[PDB]
Structure formats: structure tokens, C-alpha cells
Symmetry: C3
Subunit: 383 residues, 3 copies
């Protein structure tokens, strides 16, 4: 095929926006959630694992995620992008841009994990973990969903990565939280309000970059990109309002963290759905996702009983699951969505969504466990 | 018509840039201008009213602002974007992108108001105010200028919103300042220097997003976008220099706040003008706007006698008026501008600009008064 | 020729990204490296000199840098962009966009100098310095490399400005450091860790803007833009890892500043190379550049023996030189690069790179000396 320069332009900018979500979006986001004394370490781990992901992605991750192979992984014919002509076209853009855009997703996924857990994990251990989990969870799941693998073959709908990014990372992060203890200092049982403007700023950068993430997942500056863009605006706004409404009812007042969490919740919830649903579905998914995220972090507080940056994973995990399921509903044309595929009914699609969720949770959780254990066994996990 | 993917790409990115102006640009900007103790509240109000604006815009604001109707408002045929095919084209882009781009303008306009006043207005009251003022001031004025309404019909020149955004918001904000008192704590009579890097960072984000705002108002990545882009660079720079020059003359030294205010002043002043003037006109408008903004905040200090975030409205209001008037001059071809419309002379155009200004000020000020009073009467305005 | 709207769109967004590198990228970057008490001053100087550069660029810099003239400067036929029709096309974009994109490079180059030195230079003096050095170093060197001048005529390879931006600025900054003393307060001999998140955030913004810088230097959203984009990702990541590896070996632990410095090092090192090399060359240049930057700042510490923001110039200078030389190697097709030009062998190309480096260092250093001395003689350099 031949590249469309408009799509090339679009997709390079969307990739820059997705990179912005990690560098510095997620780092600032967690920077506002952890104690001053660990912020330096976290920023270093986020930056160094970002770099590591970037390199592993071009060395082999792109080939194994996006190369044709089997249901679970691709191939090694594109190691260091060998055999990719610079003018090769994937879709309607140069394949190199596709490489970069997909790599950026690997980065924010790993950033979501590392930003939360960095303060409790030894530096060499996080490096080992990322290698293991990027290689054996991110890459196969990305293959499965976006590389023509198992889940794509079953017709799972996941426009921009409710599974590959958010649930995948949430389970890995929650496994890390489970395996790696953290001493909560006296007086540090709740997030420090002084640092919450950094959480806001990170949320804002995540939101703006997420337009690259969601709209860019169209692969072209077309009407699906445009729909994904509008639905990102709408779901995020609806989830901010749903979360703050729920919080105002539960607690009697909105909070900044509630507003930011609601934003993330709608962004996560609409991620799988955004190119497949209408704007009404986006509104409803955003409201539900904001309320579900508030429920999820509320349940995690019952478990953890302190504020912890790993609470983020409750939002990514619960809202990723909610948005993946709700996609199976609101993709219906009767609700203004695109379409199910041939032969597919809503109930079928819902089962496929559930299957995709379950596979992602087990796959990621198993690989994460292995990667933490390997790190533990070789260098020691815990700070 | 058919969409141009280059314009689609351009316009989705410009919309992301405009959203960036609110989230987090204007929030950081005001975060540096208010006291630590109110920053949390302000960020919450900015984020929640942002969300509210986003939802009201898709529910009805787009239809009433941009639908065809009468001189003051459009219609309700596009409620929740019903009847808009995803492949509908407006101009040379998908209509959904137009929806999003226009919504982003509503958001930064409301953010300008809320960021300043949040610290003095009860949360439920700001929500009521935004509903009232978005619905009855923003939407009709946007209709009037960009939806084929009264001011467009009179040939008002306003490329990117000297009226719809800056004067509109400045009057609403100044009415709020007038109606809502604020106790100035001892020792807090001047902006805290420690927090001014946040003002800088917000100004910077407002500046970069403003390229989406001004150039995006061309609706296409053409030579008018390019002119608007260059004139944004030039007017902003010229106003930074004009403000700092005036400050250096008035006070004996430049200041960071002066530099940032000068940036805003040129951005605001060039907003109505940027697609219609030549680069020389942009330079002159920027210098004048920087000096006029310095004059305006100087006059507001005589009234307020303390530093207050509502001083921002002096810049938006004075520089919006100055840029709207100066557009009526520098749009002339003899000064390197585009053009007046058929039959139009400079003096005629100036009257039309003045008329547009006067209408915007009264309309916004009246609706703002009503929205504050309704809030007051129902939930209470004042913190 | 006729403009391609995709390229117009691309290039306006890339220009916004490059502007973002200065406003606020480099300001935040240095804001984290200098003492609280000087940050205000530095931000003011960065913002005001930014504005000055923007205006001088449209008044004459664009014409003298990009107009056809001689080996060292162009002409004055495009003063205030006169004689440029708004629909004039340069390459495949409107010439006005070219103006803006090139101006943005002038801005980040000057920001690199000013951000470092602002805290030690009087305000009027920095203004004089910028006028002199922009006019007599930046503009001629930009002419020389990108305006068809001496270095372009010799076939120097410099895709995005290893010479024009990084070495040029590094020598000017190092001359400033040499000529302008700075009292290091007691207790302030090392960068304050508390402020390093701002260094991270500035690095992040520099990184994301650098996609506009490097990919935008293709002048079109084509496969060279795409290659430049991927190589920016890869070289930056490789240099983060090379620096942190070197640091971990030298010091026993990675640091946040090391990670950020490594990012800058790969960004600088890949700047001249990014459109001419393959992704393997980018990886190798990034590793080498990260290690070379670590060596360079290590040598500057031996000279300075304190942490100082001018240490940045060791990275820009050393890594700019390394990347310019390495471009002469990795541009070879045998290493996956583009190409040398007709008749050119690697050894020839290396000599040309060395020549370009030497000329840039002497030219910039001489003009910088003159500009500092003129400032000193007229208003006084030192705070
Ligand atoms: C993404 C941010 C992650 C942690 C989210 C914190 C959100 C606010 O925190 C949550 O507020 C709720 C009610 O206001 C409570 O019910 C939850 O237990 C509490 O953790
Ligand atoms: C957009 C920022 C809004 C408040 C603007 C503060 C700008 C600096 O503040 C202003 O400085 C002037 C001279 O230096 C004085 O003449 C004004 O009274 C003072 O308010
Ligand atoms: C671009 C940032 C500029 C100053 C760079 C500081 C980078 C970290 O600082 C450097 O760390 C090295 C080993 O860790 C030492 O060998 C150097 O002497 C030290 O200056
Ligand atoms: N995607
Ligand atoms: N507009
Ligand atoms: N360039
Ligand atoms: N995320
Ligand atoms: N994400
Ligand atoms: N997030
Ligand atoms: N603004
Ligand atoms: N704006
Ligand atoms: N602003
Ligand atoms: N840079
Ligand atoms: N740069
Ligand atoms: N930098």
C-alpha cells in the first residue's frame, strides 16, 4: 500500500502524545501520590524502565507483538526492525510510525506499574520484572489483541487497550502490591494534600496524551479517530462527574483526588470502547466507570486501609474490566455503536469480552508473579 | 463535502492543544496566583466544571451554538449529536471534530472564569453559575460570532474569540469579583513569589495550546492556519516585550509575572486578529496589547489594591477589547491584512468591532449577574 | 510548488512542540538546577529573551538565515517577511510555517544558553548578548548548515542541529560560564534533590518537544520523519541506559539526574544523525552519547568542582560533537543509514563533520565572547 501523509502526521503526533503520558504524565501522577522521600527513586525507575521498554520494543517486542506468528506471539523476523523497509506501509502509515506508536503503549503500560511500585521495589529488581513481564505478558497480550492473535481471532473488541494496557497492568501492579510489603510511616496514612496538584497535573497530561492513545488507535485521521476523540472527551467528563457525584454522596464533598480519579476512570473505561460506541454510550460508560472506580478504590481501602499509589490499579483494573464489558453492549448499533462483527450477537460479544478479561487477568497475573519471583530470587524484590 | 484527513489530523491535534489550555494550563496558571490553602478547591472546581462543560456541550451546547437557528441561538436538532452522521463533514473536517474543537473553546472560557473565582465561590454555586452562563452567554455569543448569528451577520471580525472567549469570560469574571467578596489574609496582599513558577508553567501551557486555539480556528492546515500561527508567535513575543518594557519603565525592573502577563496579553490581543492581519500588524497589536494589559491591571490594582487572581480578567478584558478593535484596523490590506468584506471600509469595520464588544460585554455581564444571583439565591455564592 | 496540507499540519504541530521545548521545557529544566532564589529571574530572562528571539527572527533572522546570499548569511529581502506571499511554499509547506519552525529552533538554542546563565547575568546584559549572538552566531551558522551556506556546501550532515543548536549553544554557554563568575553559597555545592522533579519534568517536555524538533526537520510527514521519530525514541532510551549504566558503575547507583542527563545526551547525540541513520545506529549513538555525556560532565566537575546548571553545556557540547561525528559513520548504508552524497566516502564525511564542528565551536565561541564583552562594556555582565 501507500502511506497517507495526513495519517503519518496524525500518528506521529499521537505517538508523541502517548509518550507524553509516561514522560512525564504518569511520573507526575504518581509523584503526587507517594512520599517526598521516594519520589526521586520512582522518577528514576520510571525513566529507566521507560528507556528499557523502548529498547526492548525495537529489539524484539514489535516483532513478537505485531509480527505474524501464532495465537500468542508473532515472530522474530523484525528484530531491531530488520527487514522493514523504511517505506514499508502498515495500514495507511509508514510501518516505522506503527512501531513507534505501539511502543508508546508498551511504555505507558509499564509506567503504570512502575510508577506505583517503584518506591517499594529494588532498582535491579524492577528491571528484571519489566523484562520478564514486558516480554511474556505485554507482548503476548498485545499480540493476542492487536497482532491477530487469540483474542482478536475470537472477535474481542478493545479499541485502544482496556485489556492490553489497563487490565494487564492493573493485575501486574496488584500482584506486586500483594507480594511486596510497604511500611507506612506514621502520619503518612493518607495522601498528602500538598502534593495533590502534581497528581492533577499528571492526570491532565495523561488526559491530553490519551487523545493520542485513543484517537491514534484508529490508525488514521478519519471519522473513527474523530469518534474516539469525542468519546474520550465525553467519557472522561462523565466519569469525573460520576465519581464526584458518588463521592459527594458518600463523603459529603467532592475532592481533587476524586475528580482526577474520575477522569482516569472514564479514560480507562472508554479505552476499549471509544472507536466502537456512540457518544451516548460514551457518556454512560463514563458515568458507570467513574462510579465503578470509586467503588473499586473504596474496596481496596477496605483491604489496604491506607492510601497507597497502588490504589491506581483498582481504577485501571475495575474500570478496564467495566469498559471492556460495556463495550460488548454499547458497540451495538441499536445503541449508536458500530457494529458487531458478522454473526455476532450482543450476548456472544459479551462472553467474548469476559473471556478476554479473564485471559488477560490470569496471563498477566501469572507472568507478573513469575517476574516478581525471579527478581526476588536473583536480586531481592523489597527495598 | 468530503473530509480532508490532513485537516482532520490538524484539527484533532489543535483540539487536544485547546483542551490542554484548560487541563492543566489555566489550572496551573491560577494555581500560582492563589493561596496554597485554596488551590485544591480551585483545581477541583476547574476539573469538575470542565467536565460539566464537556457534557453540556455535547448534550445541547454544540447544537445551540452551531446549529442554524436565529441571530442568537441555533437549534436542538443536534442534541447529544443526534442526526450527525459520523461521516458528516463540516468545512473540510468530520463534523465530530468540529464539535470537539468548539467544545474545547467552551472549556477554556469557563476555566478562565472558574480558575479565578473558585476560591471564593461555593462548589454547588459554581456549578449552577456555569450551567447558567454557559447556556445563556457562551452559547448565544458563540452562535452570534461563529454560528452565523448576529455578530457574524454584521461582519464582526473575530478569528479565534476575542469576544466569545476573552471578553465574554472577562466580564463574567469581573462581575463575579464584584459580587463575591474575598477576605485577604494578613501578609497575602501580593502574589506569593514562591508560587510564580506555576504561573509561568501555566502561561507556557496556555501559550502552546493557544497555537491549537488560534491556528485551529482556520479549520484547516492551510495558509491562514500558518498565518495565524506566525502571528501568535509574533504578537505574544511583542506583548511580552511591550509589557516588560512598560513595567521596566514604571517599576524599574521587569518581573516574571509581568512577562507572563505580557504573553497572555499578546495571546488575547491577537486572538480576534490572528487570521486577518499581517505579521507587522501582529507585532503592533502585541506591543499595544502588552501595554494595554499592563495599564488594565494597573487600573484594577487601584480598585482592588491587592493582587488577586481576578486581575487576570483585566488582561483578558482589556486586551480582548484592544485586539478586537485593532483587528478592525489591521485587517486592512493596506496594512498587510486580509481584507475587509464586501462594501466594508475600515471605519465601518471599527464600528462593527465596537458593536460586537459592547454586545458581548452587556450580554455576558447580564447573564453572569443572573447566574451568580441564581446561585446565591439557591445555594449561596460565598464560601 | 504547492503545499501539502498533511505536511502543513505536521509542521505546525512540530513547531508548537519545538516552542514547548523552550516554553516551558528548558525553563523548568534549569529551574530544577538552580537555587530557589534565582529561579524567578531565570524564568523572566528565558521568557523575555524568548520573546526577543521570536521578534528578531521575523524582523531579520529568517531572512538572513534562510534567504539566499553567501556562504555565511542570506539576505535582507525577507525583513519582517516582506515579499513572502502567504501562499508561498517552501519545500511542501507554506513558507510561513517554515519561518515559524525555524524560529522555534532559534528560541530553544537561546533558551539553552539563557536558562543556564540567567542567574549570573544582568538582565540588560543578557538582552545585549542575545542580540549579538543570535545575529552573528545563530543566524550565520543556521545559514551555513540549513540555508545553503558553507557547511551545507561542504556536505556536512546535520539533520536537526547538532551544530546549529547544540554545539553552538554549548560553546556560547561555556564561554559565558568562563567569563562570568558565580558565588556558590555555602551548602549549595550540589544540586538540591528537592528540586530535581522539576529537572525531570523539564527533561520530559524537552523530550516530547524534541519529536517536533527531530522529526519536523524532515519538513514533511514522510518516512524520513518517521525514521527520525523512531531514532529519537531509540537513541534517547539507549543514552538513558548508557548513562545510568556508566553511573551505576562509577558511583554504585543510578540517579534521577543521571537518567535525565542520559535522555538529553541521546537527544542531543541523535539530533544531527536522526534522519540519516538506521535504528541500530541510533541505539549505538545513544549509548555512546550517554556515556560521553557522563564523561563530559565528569570532566566539567573536575574543572568546576560544584554542580552548576552550566554543566548542561557539557552534555550539549560533548554529545553534540559525538553525534555529529557519529553521523559521519552511521549515515553509511552499510550500517543501515541513508547514504553519503555523491562521491563521498565515510572518511571524507568524517572530515567534513569535524570541520563543521570546529567551525561551529570557533564561530560561536568568538561571537559569544564578543557578545559578552559588549554587554560587559556597556551595561555590565555580572549580577
Ligand atoms: C487514581 C487515584 C487512586 C487512588 C484514588 C483515591 C481517590 C479518592 O480516594 C478514595 O475516595 C473515596 C470516596 O471519596 C473512598 O470511598 C475510597 O476509599 C478512597 O480511597
Ligand atoms: C495575568 C496576570 C494577572 C495579574 C497581573 C500581574 C502582573 C504584574 O502585576 C502588575 O504589575 C504592574 C507593573 O509592574 C502594576 O502596574 C500593576 O498594578 C500590577 O498589578
Ligand atoms: C544535564 C544535567 C547536567 C548536569 C548533569 C548532572 C548529571 C549527574 O551529575 C554527574 O554525575 C556523574 C556520575 O554519576 C559524575 O561523574 C559527574 O561529575 C556529575 O556532575
Ligand atoms: N492501540
Ligand atoms: N474558533
Ligand atoms: N531543522
Ligand atoms: N493510563
Ligand atoms: N492509557
Ligand atoms: N493513570
Ligand atoms: N486564555
Ligand atoms: N484562549
Ligand atoms: N490566561
Ligand atoms: N535541547
Ligand atoms: N534541542
Ligand atoms: N537540554
Amino acid at each position: 500500500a501507500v502511506a497517507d501523509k495526513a495519517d503519518n502526521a496524525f500518528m506521529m503526533i499521537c505517538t508523541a502524545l502517548v509518550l507524553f503520558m509516561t514522560i512525564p504524565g504518569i511520573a507526575l501522577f504518581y509523584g503526587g501520590l507517594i512520599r517526598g522521600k521516594n519520589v526521586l527513586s520512582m522518577l528514576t525507575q520510571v525513566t529507566v524502565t521507560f528507556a528499557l521498554v523502548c529498547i526492548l520494543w525495537v529489539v524484539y517486542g514489535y516483532s513478537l507483538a505485531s509480527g505474524e506468528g501464532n495465537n500468542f506471539f508473532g515472530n522474530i523476523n523484525w528484530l531491531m526492525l530488520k527487514n522493514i523497509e523504511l517505506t514499508a506501509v502498515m495500514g495507511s502509515i509508514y510501518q516505522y510510525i506503527h512501531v513507534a506508536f505501539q511502543g508508546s503503549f508498551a511504555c505507558i503500560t509499564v509506567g503504570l506499574i512502575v510508577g506505583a511500585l517503584a518506591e517499594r521495589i529494588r532498582f535491579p529488581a524492577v528491571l528484571i520484572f519489566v523484562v520478564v513481564w514486558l516480554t511474556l505478558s505485554y507482548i503476548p497480550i498485545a499480540h493476542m489483541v492487536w497482532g491477530g492473535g487469540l483474542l482478536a481471532s475470537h472477535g474481542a473488541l478493545d479499541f485502544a487497550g482496556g485489556t492490553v494496557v489497563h487490565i494487564n497492568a492493573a493485575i501486574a501492579g496488584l500482584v506486586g502490591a500483594y507480594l511486596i510489603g510497604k511500611r507506612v510511616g506514621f502520619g503518612k496514612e493518607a495522601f498528602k494534600p500538598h502534593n495533590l496538584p502534581m497528581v492533577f497535573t499528571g492526570t491532565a497530561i495523561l488526559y491530553i496524551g490519551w487523545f493520542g492513545f485513543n484517537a491514534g488507535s484508529a490508525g488514521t485521521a478519519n471519522e473513527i479517530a474523530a469518534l474516539a476523540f469525542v468519546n474520550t472527551v465525553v467519557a472522561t467528563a462523565a466519569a469525573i462527574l460520576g465519581w464526584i457525584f458518588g463521592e459527594w454522596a458518600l463523603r459529603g464533598l467532592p475532592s481533587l483526588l476524586g475528580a482526577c480519579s474520575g477522569a482516569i476512570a472514564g479514560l480507562v473505561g472508554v479505552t476499549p470502547a471509544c472507536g466502537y460506541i456512540g457518544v451516548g454510550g460514551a457518556l454512560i460508560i463514563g458515568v458507570v466507570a467513574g462510579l465503578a472506580g470509586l467503588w473499586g478504590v473504596t474496596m481496596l481501602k477496605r483491604l489496604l486501609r491506607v492510601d497507597d499509589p497502588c490504589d491506581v490499579f483498582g481504577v485501571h483494573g475495575v474500570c478496564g474490566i467495566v469498559g471492556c464489558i460495556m463495550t460488548g453492549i454499547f458497540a451495538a448499533s441499536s445503541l449508536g455503536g458500530v457494529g458487531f462483527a458478522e454473526g455476532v450477537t450482543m450476548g456472544h460479544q459479551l462472553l467474548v469480552q469476559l473471556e478476554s478479561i479473564a485471559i488477560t487477568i490470569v496471563w498477566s497475573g501469572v507472568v507478573a508473579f513469575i517476574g516478581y519471583k525471579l527478581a526476588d530470587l536473583t536480586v531481592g524484590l523489597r527495598v
